Design a protein around this ligand. Structure first.
Ligand SMILES: O=P(O)(O)O[C@H]1O[C@H](CO)[C@@H](O)[C@H](O)[C@@H]1O
Ligand SMILES: [Zn+2]
Length: 458
């Protein structure tokens, strides 16, 4: 086995650049490592999916071959959204699955999201794959591949459980990612008229990058919603595990406010249910869930970490500020932008009001857009560690489960290390602009007390 770069082995999954840190050979040995780990967990059966990236066909054949070369029975589901691969790993024989995807990143990026024997791998489990390859601790066998056309089953499973009470006209922006293979068609099937934007699968991403977390990537969606007098706008990220939302008047509903609507819905049928959200989400979500009799559970950012927390708590719903939304109620517990869009349309269609009014009813605070500070990969965790050791935050509820978050009577602030880029991520929100600035000042001073040279671009 060859020497693969350590940098592609990340906290949540494997992420690289094709031609640079990710080659065909690397996909092969990663397949070998995953196959070996699946077998060590008693699971010979592994589903494999890929997104609509240009490098998909080349790297996916190597991933599959690495798996068969362990003795694994592979189910090749072809080109699908990430959640359809997770679906396959819940409904086929095996509980293992690998998705070849570069998520929302530029064209040349790819990567692997990995489920082994029901468990989404993270942290030291991803490192353990890297280590198997270095040690040649790898299975050898004569496996097999069967092709499985799973998209029609996924389509029908969703369609048969969603009950829209009336028609809606929805603009759907796929960003030329892989969601175009099912989302527009499925949403129409639910009982909608659909106005497509960038729904042709095209790995060059010639229009805007499929990344609905950035307002600029929703500009075209907002304009089309308004131009066509549509009831809602929906945008999917490149691999379909994230969704973004805009109302009939063009207001962006950030995923933490989306989760309020979903949490009300899930808890209404499931008294006392755990509902998970990441440290990037509005504090208003804590009170809202508690008020409905749910148990709010704040947890680490990162899809794989949220998925693990789901298993540990029995949560019926989870969501991240990035728009990864995980339904366990009526579903399987994995993140799925398409399924989440279907659940949103079901709820909105049962309300006489328009989507703008449905969402504006919930309490709102003044929020910042994400703040990112570039540091280094080898210093970002130590900055956080120093804050956790040394910092003083004044009176507040301090949470260090991921970075440092402090919840004050009238607002909150967060600083944490990104696990996908060499950056500190900050968020602030408050009742008033005055409190927003008081909190920002606390955080600015605590960063400067650790390292007075740190940028404080806020
Ligand atoms: O902040 P981080 O560590 O860079 O992680 C970001 O990307 C993850 C993968 O989509 C998401 O799961 C996270 O929610 C977040 O958007
Ligand atoms: Zn994604």
């Amino acid at each position: 086995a060859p020497t693969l770069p350590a940098s592609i082995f990340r906290a949540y999954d494997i992420r690289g650049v094709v031609g640079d840190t990710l080659t065909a050979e690397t996909a092969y040995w990663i397949g070998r490592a995953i196959g070996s780990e699946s077998l060590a967990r008693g699971e010979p059966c592994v589903a494999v999916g890929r997104d609509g990236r240009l490098s998909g066909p080349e790297l996916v054949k190597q991933l599959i071959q690495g798996l068969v070369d362990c003795g694994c029975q592979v189910s090749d589901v072809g080109m699908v959204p990430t959640p359809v691969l997770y679906y396959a790993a819940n409904v086929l024989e095996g509980k293992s699955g690998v998705m070849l995807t570069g998520s929302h990143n530029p064209p040349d990026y790819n990567g692997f999201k990995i489920v082994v024997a029901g468990e989404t791998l993270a942290n030291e489990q991803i490192q353990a794959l890297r280590e198997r390859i270095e040690k040649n601790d790898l299975a050898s066998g004569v496996g097999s591949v069967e092709q499985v056309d799973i998209l029609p089953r996924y389509f029908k499973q969703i369609r048969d459980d969603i009950a829209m009470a009336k028609p809606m006209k929805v603009v759907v922006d796929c960003g030329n990612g892989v969601a175009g293979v099912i989302a527009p068609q499925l949403i129409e099937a639910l009982g909608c008229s659909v106005i497509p934007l960038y729904c042709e699968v095209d790995g060059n991403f010639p229009n805007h990058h499929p990344d609905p977390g950035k307002p600029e990537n929703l500009k075209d969606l907002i304009a089309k919603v308004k131009a066509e007098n549509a009831d809602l706008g929906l945008a999917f990220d490149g691999d379909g595990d994230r969704v973004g939302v805009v109302t009939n008047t063009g207001t962006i509903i950030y995923p933490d406010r989306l989760l309020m609507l979903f949490a009300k819905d899930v808890v209404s049928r499931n008294p006392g249910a755990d509902i998970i959200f990441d440290v990037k989400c509005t504090r208003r979500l804590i009170a809202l869930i508690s008020g409905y009799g749910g148990r709010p559970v704040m947890w680490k950012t990162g899809h794989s970490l949220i998925k693990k927390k789901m298993k540990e708590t029995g949560a019926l719903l989870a969501g991240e500020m990035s728009g990864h939304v995980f339904f366990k109620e009526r579903w399987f517990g994995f993140d799925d932008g398409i399924y989440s869009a279907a659940r949103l349309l079901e709820i909105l269609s049962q309300d006489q009001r328009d989507s703008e009014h449905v969402f504006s009813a919930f309490p709102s605070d003044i929020s910042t857009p994400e703040i990112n500070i570039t540091v280094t990969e080898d210093s970002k965790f130590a900055i956080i560690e120093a804050l956790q050791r040394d910092a003083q935050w004044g009176e507040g509820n301090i949470t260090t489960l991921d970075g440092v978050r402090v919840d004050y009577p009238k607002g909150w602030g967060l600083v944490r290390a990104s696990n996908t880029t060499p950056v500190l991520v900050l968020r602030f929100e408050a009742d008033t602009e005055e409190e927003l600035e008081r909190i920002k000042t606390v955080f600015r001073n605590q960063l400067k007390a650790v390292d007075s040279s740190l940028p404080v671009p806020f």
